[PDB]
Design a binder for these strands. Structure first.
Ligand code: ZN
Ligand code: ZN
Lengths: 122, 123
DNA sequence: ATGCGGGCGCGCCCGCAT
DNA sequence: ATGCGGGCGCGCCCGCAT
């Protein structure tokens, strides 16, 4: 059942990462939201409507140094998912969170919002 | 750094059953674990450089949850790894039996595991 | 009913970029 | 000299051989 969800999210990718990298990052996030139906629904809504339909934060636990590893490569979780679904050429320090983003990376909370439509490019 | 001399003398006694990178990494890892265990580092050097003729006490490392130790991306049992490096280059998984005086043998399922290759026998 | 195995990531740490 | 990104290991996870 998560295969359908993963595939649907994968079709909205921009191609800034390898197929293996994007698949692994999407599967990892979906698994983290397994018992967070509201946040999984928010991600699907945000991604499949290309941000037109409003959504709440999609959060994952923050690691000791803030970085997330996917297929042997480390990076910030909000940059990883914003690079997958919105800016394929995205670099570090090119993101500013929106006013309504309660769990932004900049806020240095226990959890980090990875909703790509909760960030803006600079 | 003084540990270079120790890693070299222990490398001389390698049998060639593993790659240079694997042997170097495994020996460096063990030496680092014995950093504040002078008696156990001395026991290992004594055992290895005398080819087991000079008696030695147990050379122990902390046991991991599943017993396995990872070296250069490859997992295996710590007592089999070091027994393969200095004694039996063709050594496989359940080919080892500890000696009577081995107090921390793998087989005893204790907190610490003896990796002294001269504290085991082949079957 | 276990225990391999092997994939994979966070935490630790080294050695390399600055 | 030394802070920091990238390599690597133990723990977790899970399928399958034993
Ligand atoms: Zn948000
Ligand atoms: Zn022993």
């Amino acid at each position: 059942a998560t295969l359908g969800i993963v595939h649907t999210l994968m079709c909205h990718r921009q191609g800034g990462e390898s197929e293996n990298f994007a698949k692994r990052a999407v599967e990892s996030l979906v698994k983290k939201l397994k018992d967070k139906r509201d946040e999984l629904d928010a991600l699907i809504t945000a991604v499949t409507s290309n941000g037109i339909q409003q959504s709440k934060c999609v959060t994952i636990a923050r690691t000791l140094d803030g970085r997330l590893q996917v297929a042997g490569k480390k990076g910030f979780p909000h940059v990883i998912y914003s690079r997958i679904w919105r800016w394929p050429d995205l670099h570090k320090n090119e993101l500013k969170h929106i006013k309504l983003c309660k769990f932004a990376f900049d806020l240095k909370l226990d959890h980090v919002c990875v909703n790509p439509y909760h960030y803006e490019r600079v």
